[PDB]
Amino acid sequence: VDATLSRGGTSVDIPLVEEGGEILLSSTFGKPEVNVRKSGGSLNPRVIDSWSGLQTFQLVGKLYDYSTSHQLADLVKTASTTPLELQIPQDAYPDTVTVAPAAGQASALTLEYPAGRKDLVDVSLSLTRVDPNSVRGVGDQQATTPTTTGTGPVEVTAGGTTVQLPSSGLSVERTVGRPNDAVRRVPRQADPRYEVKAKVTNDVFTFSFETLDNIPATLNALTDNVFREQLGRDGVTLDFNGLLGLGSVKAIPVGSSPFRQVHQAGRGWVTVPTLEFRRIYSNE
Amino acid sequence: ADTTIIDAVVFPQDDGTGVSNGDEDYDSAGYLASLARYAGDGSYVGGDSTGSPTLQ
Amino acid sequence: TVHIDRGVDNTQWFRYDIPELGKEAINEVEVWFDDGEESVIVDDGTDKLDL
């Protein structure tokens, strides 16, 4: 029923549960390092297989409290040379595999907190199988999610002005990954080497909502203070005020399309499909 | 030692002085006239037009 | 004589490329001087013995 993901003392059980005929587990096997010749005077190429293969695990599940969700995010984001162990509840797998968060990806863990659902979180994990004895590194960096026991609106503070995000149709997605870790080929064995790096991680919060009332004032406050100002080295304070048990993080909107205002025919309100924030330097 | 004067006013104040972007003063006439009363070179207590020190 | 007080903390770098450069290095120089009529050998014994 539950897959256990653990690192020493820290343990999270993810219920491998989903509706109907949805994919709970995908295990992809590969040989990224086979050299197949592009040319030569044969009909069929000569090949050489000399290196570790690839095994990628994709886990889809559901978590029944926010506390465990934050623990999972912290577990995935942490830089530590203590092996990360995955226990899969299926007989086609060994009892424990040693894993890295997806080898080069910004999105190893996705957590979705959708509208209408209470105490039910969507989990998507991507993990890469690494050699248990080849987890190498120097630094420990303990990831923490700031938590508080409030109830207040999601607040966005930039340049002395606070915007309160509409509760109406409000969804949150959190993406976590470790793209700066190196998973590397080794000769003569099945599984690659994991170089744990005490370096920059990916941590992104995405919001979706409908703006229903005081529409100009709400949207203009966000766009004027966040988008039309230069923020400098500092950024935006994103405060959950205890929603989902979350607190305050420093963030910035990144890229070409982090915010969209959508107007549909015959509607008296504005849709925000996406508002994206990446967590910036804070952690002493 | 501490004492807040709850009805005191200070001018002029904006982002360039130490206040946040919301907290700028308004350009009231009385403020412009009272500021234009400056004539010294240092910090000083102003005169009532009898020349008598105010804030006695 | 001058120190940059700010420094580069572990959070303040974001790329690095640090070599030891040694491809040009030699251990003996002979200099002819005085219209080429006299010579001096400069002798780096350490590198010669280490090689």
Partner: protein, 50 residues
């Protein structure tokens, strides 16, 4: 053409204060031939453990 050293193979060198040896070095072998001047370039560096 110093007496003890002309025609000999030189292998070591040392900075001294009369009798007392302050530094010692191994040199790559050379013969000090007749009419050859031999000179030192002895670096003493004072430093710390950072």
């Amino acid at each position: 053409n110093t007496s003890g050293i002309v025609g000999q193979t030189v292998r070591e060198a040392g900075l001294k204060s009369g009798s007392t040896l302050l530094t010692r070095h191994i040199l790559a072998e050379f013969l000090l031939d007749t009419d050859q001047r031999l000179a030192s370039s002895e670096s003493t560096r004072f430093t710390s453990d950072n």
